[PDB]
């Protein structure tokens, strides 16, 4: 019986140049796991030295990793996920896991899972997901447009796999650059790629439903839109001061006006009696995400479920900090009928986790950014091989995924 | 002493949303290696695609990935995966091309790159263990970080800074990633451009080249950093894109082969600017031995398109006395092996060595393993955001963590035109 022998976690950086932690897990039969961290919600722990990366350092997390959770896990069965996280939690002591840090304690959780993954010959799908499953290929949503809300997206929700809804993204996004440069508007990217052009939000999907007719798609069928208004940003609601109620019309005018299929935060997470009636108004009619709401936390969710808030959410790992407690939310989610959408974080890293996560929990929404930058392909990618790996038994969600 | 049992392709993304493969060979021992391909933006190795455009615009590679699991596969069945002369001369003859145009210098790298992961994995070493073999000697190379781009206002393509200075690669990256945040920061409160470009370098509007070098300089005082110290510029020029018979289309003008000469000059001199790269065309190599006679001992003079990674091309220009290092790039040749004999042929004229990425990169980390195994002392692989690019800095961080003392950071003794 392969045990845990060692852990070790260095200083890396992240895909904007800020300091994170990579974790390798070894154990006794010599296999080992590798998992790096992305980028209220579980606290992540900082150096705030000034002098070194702008305060930004992970050393002190590192510390926690490699001493005082190496410590108390040496001697674990990796296959005890649950134990092995509520050993993390209990050392931790607190409820934000401000002592040890979420970077800290999620990095191990992670690569536990890798190690035993690895022991035992699977894939990090197979051995999360069952022999078994279901398993299924998430569909993407993917942020072209950003914002002078913060994403405009793009669902390929009538590709008929998922190869084919990222080849329908890739050229979605190459007919808006070259718009965008025929118009003499901005064209680089921001952290998650996507283009900052621009007059009123509105006029921002007006040029991405052109570069989905340019490649020849239909907008009705192929590919949709979604959005994130941020709004927690917004609030007591910022072109102009709209109340909750003004700002409900307009999403639900836009719902009207465009194939808008799915809405992140349309209000702030201080809100809740107005996400209620955004809700009542639009839950079977959109996709109502909530990200800043929920922050990946069971518990909040469980409330949210009760008082009728939303009708989907947004799973970030980090934001939680362990493995066990993010699925607890997944299977919450999906046992009351609300949408799971596995997401990354705006500092991400070569570490494609969330691709296994998507399918071995059957979530069948991914948000893993533009169509530009390794940070955000290199999840694609595995995806691509997940898929050809899968074949038959990992059907593309398509509009499948959408339970509203 | 296992043997190749199985080679598969197949079509993936890079990190410009355009169509690359990736590879895996696997061998009987079910040890098995991963590679990917990535992609640059004259004689250069034939990148094969499949022009259908109606898929991804034509730049899909079907053709290629087909390329590999059939004929390459094919020819390949059974060899050991250590013999990569061997391996890359089969693929070399099979193409029978000067060019790969037939095969695909893509399909043929991929497969060449996968056999070395292959064999690395089976006898369970890391890539540069394996290629630079049990002793070694190992280095961390000295990067060069592309931090303003160009060529949206700017002639010049790369601006870049070089931390020489740092005492090992870590504090390299460190300093580096300061300069990037700081820069960042100037730029946001200037209320100037901030997005970036496909090496993830920043690229705001600027009144001159020069500026760009300016703005750089201001970024590394601000991160207390010490210009022309612990930290210098390096520049691409790219000059092959701004040369229309017989001039350089420079800042809204039009210079000679010696006015651009001149220009240089001045920048080397006015700054602490330690290399140069393709500060001529790849065809004005008369202007080009000028150059080198000018600057050969004053600054590094990197060879990129001129020489594009090909060993019978850079001989040629060590016979003329052209440039005093070259850009080494895996797909512009198409082989690990005629990749290494390009790095053996410039170490034994003296000539400097930068491994570098492509503008399409993917996740693929090999040009880290390889600047360390070759102690090549130069590497040449992006701005400070993108996985793209950081994925290949994360890399050469834990290889230095695990060489440790064995593989010293390069600093000065990279450079060695003096
Ligand atoms: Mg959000
Ligand atoms: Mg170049």
Aim: charged share 25%.
């Amino acid at each position: 019986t392969a045990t845990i022998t060692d852990i070790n976690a260095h200083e890396i950086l992240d895909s904007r140049a800020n300091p994170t932690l990579e974790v390798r897990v070894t154990l006794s039969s010599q296999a080992y796991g590798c998992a790096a961290v992305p980028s209220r919600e579980a606290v992540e722990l900082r150096d705030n030295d000034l002098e070194r990366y702008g305060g930004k350092g992970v050393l002190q997390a590192v510390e926690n990793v490699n001493g005082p959770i190496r410590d108390a896990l040496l001697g674990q069965d990796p296959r005890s996920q649950e134990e092995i996280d509520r050993i993390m939690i209990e050392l931790d002591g607190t409820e934000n896991k401000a002592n040890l840090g979420a970077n800290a304690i999620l990095g191990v959780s992670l690569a536990v899972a890798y190690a035993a993954a690895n022991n035992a010959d699977l894939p990090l799908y197979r051995y999360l997901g069952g022999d078994g499953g279901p398993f299924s290929m998430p569909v993407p949503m993917m942020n072209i447009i950003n914002g002078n809300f913060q994403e405009f997206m793009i669902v390929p929700v009538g590709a008929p796999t998922f190869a084919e809804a990222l080849r329908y993204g890739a050229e979605v996004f190459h007919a808006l650059k070259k718009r965008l440069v025929s118009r003499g508007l901005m064209s680089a990217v921001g952290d998650e790629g996507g283009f900052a052009p621009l007059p009123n939000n509105e006029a921002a999907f007006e040029l991405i439903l052109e570069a989905i007719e340019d490649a020849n798609y239909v907008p009705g069928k192929d590919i949709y839109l979604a959005l994130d208004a941020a709004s927690s940003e917004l609030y007591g609601y910022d072109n102009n001061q709209l109340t909750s109620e003004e700002m409900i019309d307009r999403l639900t005018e836009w719902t009207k006006k465009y194939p808008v299929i799915s809405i992140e935060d349309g209000l702030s997470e201080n809100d809740w009696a107005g996400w209620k009636l955004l809700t009542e108004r639009l839950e079977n009619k959109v996709q109502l995400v909530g990200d800043d709401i929920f922050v990946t936390n069971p518990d909040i969710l469980e409330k949210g479920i009760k008082k009728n808030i939303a009708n989907a959410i947004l799973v970030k790992l980090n934001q939680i900090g362990t493995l066990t407690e993010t699925l607890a939310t997944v299977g919450l989610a999906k046992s009351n009928k609300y949408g799971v959408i596995i997401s990354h974080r705006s500092g991400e890293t070569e570490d494609t986790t969330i691709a296994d996560l998507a399918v071995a929990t059957d979530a069948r929404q991914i948000k893993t950014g533009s169509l530009c930058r390794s940070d955000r392909v290199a999840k694609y990618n595995r995806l691509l091989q997940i898929e050809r790996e899968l074949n038959d038994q990992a059907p593309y969600a398509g509009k499948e995924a959408f339970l509203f």
